[PDB]
Design a protein around this ligand. Structure first.
Ligand SMILES: O=C1OCCC/C1=C\Nc1ccccc1
Length: 464
């Protein structure tokens, strides 16, 4: 990894563009006006890419050679980078102040600030914008996952009277559906801020290495079938496949994909009749989890529940909602995103089915179908020092008032009613509000403040 080659190309030319005599460039990150965001992921980026000796004579020579060919000209700031190498043993003369990780902040508030600590390195602040802006992804995954937890919490409480099993209601199936191995780990870890069920193993190592938990692992899974383990038995032997799998995992929960040929037939005739004797004998701690995987998500769920309700003893809970026996549950793991999740639980409630009957699996919808535009995650310069005088800087496009940026030195405060406010133009220096919620997390190549994954989880908790 070479930090000199980890920026947008045009940034290589920006040191020549700033006003002459600029000693300080101060920039901030916000999710511009999903009403609130989970702040998560910066700690991973600081440790992996920004801390320690990030500059070497070899890295400078390597970058010089690449940029000479890439621009077909000598534009690369070799003097500036050689200065950091000689003066600071290749450590970044940068200060990063950030809100604590797991903090739930309303939109349009400062989440972190970046500034150079040496006047010669005025250009460094925005050089590292590209690396830092990538924190949009764990922020958005964590925020979207938490919003789905809010929907599940609302309907589980309404249909059952409690939140039992809530942290296992949305399982991460997204490993194959993401753009890379690195994305898989970052995304899976952001989902684990809110839930405990994951199939994306990559998230486990990332948490252990960069955040840490008191528990041996942050996430869990159970044995489950896939189309290949069912279809390898042959079309006429689906019953033999099901019997073998539930017998191999007789004492643990087991999920079985039942839609290879005909989901309604598997529920009614295979599970509901032929293998019913292997289901009713199961423990409350080892249910069979029927998994539909195609068709209209809501229509399939309701039809599967009506079939199961007629083949198995259904009870009515204290809220008047239908509950399957404890050895039988359903997992819907196809076509699940925040919109369809809401349609399913609302459809179940209208048909008097408790949310305790169902769990969800989400792949692409959870980890890939998200962009930086969803929460409007943006990094902009708000303050510069030129000829020793500080000036408030901002953009305000005529055609888009929503793109107007904040001015001057920023701070985040608790209001008297306990909400959040971002103070602009260094107004935080007037002690009219409490202490600034931003802490120095990075300074001069060192990580100065860290959070464990348990602290993040506590900070990201729902109000309910
Ligand atoms: O069905 C299941 O029930 C619960 C345990 C995991 C599981 C399925 N996992 C999965 C992973 C990646 C793609 C598809 C499914």
């Amino acid at each position: 990894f070479n930090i000199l080659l980890a920026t947008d190309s045009y940034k290589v030319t920006h040191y020549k563009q700033y006003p002459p005599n600029t000693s300080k460039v101060y920039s901030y990150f916000e999710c511009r006006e999903y009403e609130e965001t989970v702040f998560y992921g910066l700690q991973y980026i600081l440790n992996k890419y920004l801390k320690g000796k990030v500059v070497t004579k070899e890295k400078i020579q390597e970058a010089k050679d690449v940029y000479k060919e890439h621009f077909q000209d000598d534009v690369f700031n070799e003097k500036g980078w050689n200065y950091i190498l000689e003066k600071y043993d290749g450590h970044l003369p940068i200060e990063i102040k950030a809100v604590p990780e797991g903090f739930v902040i309303p939109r349009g508030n400062v989440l972190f600030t970046v500034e150079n600590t040496d006047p010669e390195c005025y250009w460094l602040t925005n050089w590292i914008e590209t690396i830092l802006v990538q924190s949009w992804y764990p922020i958005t995954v964590a925020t979207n996952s938490r919003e789905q937890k809010k929907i599940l919490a609302k309907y589980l409480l309404e249909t059952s009277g409690n939140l039992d099993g809530l942290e296992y209601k949305l399982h991460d199936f997204g490993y194959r559906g993401v753009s890379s191995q690195e994305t898989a780990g970052i995304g899976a870890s952001a989902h684990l801020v809110n839930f405990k069920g994951t199939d994306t193993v990559a998230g486990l190592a990332l948490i252990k290495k960069y955040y840490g938990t008191k528990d041996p692992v942050p996430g869990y899974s159970v044995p489950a079938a896939e189309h290949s383990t069912i279809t390898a038995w042959g079309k006429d032997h689906e019953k033999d496949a099901f019997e073998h799998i539930v017998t191999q995992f007789s004492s643990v929960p087991v999920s079985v994909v039942s839609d290879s040929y005909d989901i309604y037939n598997a529920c009614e005739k295979i599970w509901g009749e032929d293998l019913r004797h292997l289901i009713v004998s199961r423990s409350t701690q080892a249910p069979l989890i029927i998994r539909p995987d195609s068709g209209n998500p809501l229509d399939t769920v309701l039809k599967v529940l009506e079939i199961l309700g007629k083949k198995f003893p259904v009870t009515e809970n204290s809220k008047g909602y239908k509950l399957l026996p404890p050895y039988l549950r359903v997992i819907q793991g196809d076509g699940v995103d925040i919109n369809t999740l809401q349609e399913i639980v609302e459809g179940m409630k209208q048909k008097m089915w408790s949310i305790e009957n169902i769990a969800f699996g989400s792949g692409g919808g959870l980890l890939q179908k998200l962009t930086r535009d969803l929460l409007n995650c943006s990094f902009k310069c708000s303050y510069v020092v030129t000829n020793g005088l500080g000036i408030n800087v901002f953009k305000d496009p005529v055609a888009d008032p929503n793109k107007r940026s904040k001015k001057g030195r920023l701070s985040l405060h608790r209001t008297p009613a306990g909400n959040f406010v971002t103070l602009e133009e260094g107004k935080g220096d007037l002690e009219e509000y409490g202490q600034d919620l931003l802490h120095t997390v990075f300074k001069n190549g060192k990580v100065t403040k860290s959070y464990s994954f348990d602290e993040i989880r506590k900070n990201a908790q729902l109000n309910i």
